[PDB]
Amino acid sequence: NLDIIGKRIEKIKQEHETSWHYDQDHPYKTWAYHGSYETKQTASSMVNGVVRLLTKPWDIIPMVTQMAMTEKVDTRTQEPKEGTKKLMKITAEWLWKELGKKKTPRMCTREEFTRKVRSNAWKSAREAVEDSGFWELVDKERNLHLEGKCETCVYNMMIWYMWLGARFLEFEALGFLNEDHWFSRENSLSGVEGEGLHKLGYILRDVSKKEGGAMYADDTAGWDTRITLEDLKNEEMVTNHMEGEHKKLAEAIFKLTYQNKVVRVQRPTTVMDIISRRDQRGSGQVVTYGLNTFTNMEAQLIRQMEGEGVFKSIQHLTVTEEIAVKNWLVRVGRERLSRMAISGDDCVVKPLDDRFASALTALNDMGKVRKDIQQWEPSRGWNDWTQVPFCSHHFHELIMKDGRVLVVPCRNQDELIGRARISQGAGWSLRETACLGKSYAQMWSLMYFHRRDLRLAANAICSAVPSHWVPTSATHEWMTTEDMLTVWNRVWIQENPWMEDKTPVESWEEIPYLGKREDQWCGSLIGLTSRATWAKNIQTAINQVRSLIGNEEYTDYMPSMKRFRR
Ligand SMILES: Cc1cccc(O[C@@H]2CCN(C)C2=O)c1F
Ligand SMILES: [Cl-]
Ligand SMILES: [Zn+2]
Numbered sequence: 001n002l003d004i005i006g007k008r009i010e011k012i013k014q015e016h017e018t019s020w021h022y023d024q025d026h027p028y029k030t031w032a033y034h035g036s037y038e039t040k041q042t043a044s045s046m047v048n049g050v051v052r053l054l055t056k057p058w059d060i061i062p063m064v065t066q067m068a069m070t071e072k073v074d075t076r077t078q079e080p081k082e083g084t085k086k087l088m089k090i091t092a093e094w095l096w097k098e099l100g101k102k103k104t105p106r107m108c109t110r111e112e113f114t115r116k117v118r119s120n121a122w123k124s125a126r127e128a129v130e131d132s133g134f135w136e137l138v139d140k141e142r143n144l145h146l147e148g149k150c151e152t153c154v155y156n157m158m159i160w161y162m163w164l165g166a167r168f169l170e171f172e173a174l175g176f177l178n179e180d181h182w183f184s185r186e187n188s189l190s191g192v193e194g195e196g197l198h199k200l201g202y203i204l205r206d207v208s209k210k211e212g213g214a215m216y217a218d219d220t221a222g223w224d225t226r227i228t229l230e231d232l233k234n235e236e237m238v239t240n241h242m243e244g245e246h247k248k249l250a251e252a253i254f255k256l257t258y259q260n261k262v263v264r265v266q267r268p269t270t271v272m273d274i275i276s277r278r279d280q281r282g283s284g285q286v287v288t289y290g291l292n293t294f295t296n297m298e299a300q301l302i303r304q305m306e307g308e309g310v311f312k313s314i315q316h317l318t319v320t321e322e323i324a325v326k327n328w329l330v331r332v333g334r335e336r337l338s339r340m341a342i343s344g345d346d347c348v349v350k351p352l353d354d355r356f357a358s359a360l361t362a363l364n365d366m367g368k369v370r371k372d373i374q375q376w377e378p379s380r381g382w383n384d385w386t387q388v389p390f391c392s393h394h395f396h397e398l399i400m401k402d403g404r405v406l407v408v409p410c411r412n413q414d415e416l417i418g419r420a421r422i423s424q425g426a427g428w429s430l431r432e433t434a435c436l437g438k439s440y441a442q443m444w445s446l447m448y449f450h451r452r453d454l455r456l457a458a459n460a461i462c463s464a465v466p467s468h469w470v471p472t473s474a475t476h477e478w479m480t481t482e483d484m485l486t487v488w489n490r491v492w493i494q495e496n497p498w499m500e501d502k503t504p505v506e507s508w509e510e511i512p513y514l515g516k517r518e519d520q521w522c523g524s525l526i527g528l529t530s531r532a533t534w535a536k537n538i539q540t541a542i543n544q545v546r547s548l549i550g551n552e553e554y555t556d557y558m559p560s561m562k563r564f565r566r
């Protein structure tokens with residue numbers, strides 16, 4: 001305990017020796033209060049005017065306009081039963097071994113870390129890299145870990161954050177998981193890391209082709225808050241596949257920063273509290289993704305074991321049941337992993353049959369309680385892969401006029417237009433705002449070409465922003481100045497392993513839409529008076545934005561669509 005977190009607490013107290021206090025009215029029951037000190041300080045979502053001027057009909061849709069305006073953390077999950085714990089340990093050992101069969105754990109390097117900083121995700125961290133003083137501090141902490149101690153690895157609430165140095169040490173020990181694609185479908189069988197939103201539909205359709213029952217897509221309630229110390233210890237077992245320095249460095253990150261967290265949090269009552277918890281997820285956005293994918297893969301194999309009647313009770317695992325679990329994993333584990341599509345806390349499972357639906361004892365006792373359903377009510381499965389929710393999307397099967405088959409991503413169009421109308425942070429020039437608009441427009445042309453309103457608005461934004469201006473922000477092929485019909489052909493035809501005939505598409509009229517009623521169901525404004533006026537007069541809205549940016553080189557993309565041809 002304090003033997004691992006002490007120094008960090010001691011260091012902070014010293015830097016604030018003239019404002020320390022052990023407030024006895026602290027609002028913490030599940031987090032351990034250590035003290036506070038004087039603090040004073042706070043980012044609200046701003047509107048992208050380029051996108052908003054070119055999406056006027058949506059100015060009166062509350063679902064869109066309300067997106068731009070604007071408890072579970074202090075909870076405790078019970079220690080699972082012993083049979084649950086044995087199931088998890090056995091499954092986690094086997095999964096780490098399967099993931100490392102065709103992969104080599106290895107350290108990430110300052111050079112890799114630096115290049116990422118010089119390319120985005122001392123003031124800015126891009127300045128600390130050059131200052132060797134920073135790296136001197138890193139080595140200090142680094143040699144501090146090698147002894148099994150930490151002093152500078154404390155999270156700052158507000159998506160917790162850490163000093164760049166601590167981020168590097170986590171990257172040096174665990175970066176290999178994302179950088180070498182451990183949760184790729186090829187290597188994990190259930191994973192989709194790096195697979196792309198033009199690939200998720202095809203994946204779900206392949207899972208659908210397997211013999212079995214319904215497709216289940218149960219979202220967990222506050223997954224980040226339900227990670228047990230048992231899960232963190234099962235995650236740590238990746239170190240068993242490591243060697244030398246790496247093995248000790250990874251062990252330290254798991255022991256000192258994950259399985260023993262120290263966090264600073266603001267409290268208006270403004271006294272910065274210093275709480276400590278050994279449970280829940282408190283790592284990187286990228287390591288969190290991969291460890292979430294891993295623990296979700298483990299939970300879903302165990303839920304599959306329970307449906308298939310591999311174990312009878314979680315209270316205790318018999319020696320015979322252990323051999324049965326191990327034999328099940330060795331005999332059908334890879335096939336069972338291929339039945340799932342997991343992305344961090346998000347999953348779709350096509351189990352052997354619908355006994356899975358009522359198999360809830362292990363899932364509930366692991367703490368992975370389902371959202372918006374009664375703890376013991378059986379799961380509502382899906383009978384059609386095109387209505388399954390995954391990664392905030394559903395997928396449409398769409399037949400091209402030449403009979404070739406596209407599987408396309410889709411979501412409620414209010415959500416897509418609402419997100420494009422928002423810019424994160426401040427100090428945006430007109431040009432930087434125009435180029436963020438252009439990133440949305442190019443994404444829409446690539447992924448959402450099949451929605452009539454988004455193809456039209458994407459053409460309008462690309463016509464309203466200078467042709468040579470560069471778009472600025474798994475697979476983001478819209479982040480380019482290349483012609484969008486050429487990127488469409490590469491993504492949907494040339495590089496698409498589900499498409500046998502590689503004949504390029506010659507124009508945008510050969511690229512199909514959803515049904516008109518399909519379009520409206522998914523939130524299109526086709527058939528509204530406001531939308532017809534918007535379309536008819538689109539060249540006037542384009543001209544308004546062009547007049548604001550000024551006399552630059554612009555290209556007219558509206559003649560790509562049939563109606564705008566003279
Ligand atoms: C381009 C276009 C313009 C106007 C109406 C349209 O379709 C109407 C409106 C919704 N719906 C199911 C229809 O049949 C349309 F597609
Ligand atoms: Cl139709
Ligand atoms: Zn440390």
Ligand SMILES: [Zn+2]
Pocket residue numbers: 394396410411522
């Ligand atoms: Zn849809």
